[PDB]
């Protein structure tokens, strides 16, 4: 059916690293479909489709450039989609996606700024019919704590909260929180329990005790609303 080409792929970042809903190295393509001329997101390897998404306007549900806790030189592009299933997770060397689009005459040329990148691709987004936030430039937040025995980083986005990126990874519509309640008061940590509209009960420990005063905003904030 596709086939993708220099004449109709918009841009294409080679050798990024996914981790969700595979972990695999890939190339990330943007093209305009021959089949129906419309908009395409798809990763792959050497040219086995590995993934793809269609009609990106209907069916990118969130995406965001979220940090990598501790690790400047890397981010995360995150997506959640119902393709024709989990959220794509990639890391993108900030560095090396930098070089890429030099050499493919987007950017000019000792331009530094990594956010550059950030803005061409959401760009993209926008031509190609979705958005993508970027809510953590240098307030939104992140925290690393545990969910049962694995550590990991929950993010405050301003209508999401993210906790990844071990399996599952986890997205709740700051609509979807019922409450948030405070337990395990240690001298040093406490935990917090999320309550989904949903019934459903979900429990992040040892969040470190200087993190509750942003916690706490948050949620009066999205619950005064």
Do not use: W
């Amino acid at each position: 059916m596709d086939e993708i080409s220099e004449t109709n792929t918009i841009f294409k970042l080679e050798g990024v690293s996914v981790l969700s809903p595979l972990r695999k190295k890939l190339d990330l393509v943007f093209y305009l479909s021959n089949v129906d001329g419309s908009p395409v997101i798809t990763l792959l390897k050497g040219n086995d489709r590995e993934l793809s998404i269609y009609q990106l306007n209907k069916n990118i549900k969130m995406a965001s450039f979220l940090p990598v806790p501790e690790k400047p030189n890397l981010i995360y592009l995150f997506m959640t989609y119902t393709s024709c299933s989990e959220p794509v997770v990639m890391t993108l060397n900030k560095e090396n996606t930098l070089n890429q689009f030099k050499n493919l005459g987007l950017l000019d040329s000792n331009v530094t700024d990594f956010e550059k990148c950030v803005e061409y691709i959401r760009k993209q987004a926008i031509l190609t019919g979705f958005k993508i936030s970027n809510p953590f430039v240098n307030n939104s937040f992140h925290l690393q704590c545990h969910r049962g025995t694995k550590e990991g980083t929950l993010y405050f986005l301003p209508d999401h909260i993210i906790f990844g990126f071990k399996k599952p990874i986890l997205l709740f519509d700051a609509s979807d929180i019922e409450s948030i309640t405070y337990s395990s008061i240690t001298r040093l940590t406490f935990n917090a329990s999320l309550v989904t509209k949903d019934g459903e009960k979900y429990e992040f420990s040892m969040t470190d005790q200087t993190e509750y005063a942003k916690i706490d905003d948050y949620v009066k904030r999205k619950q005064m609303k």
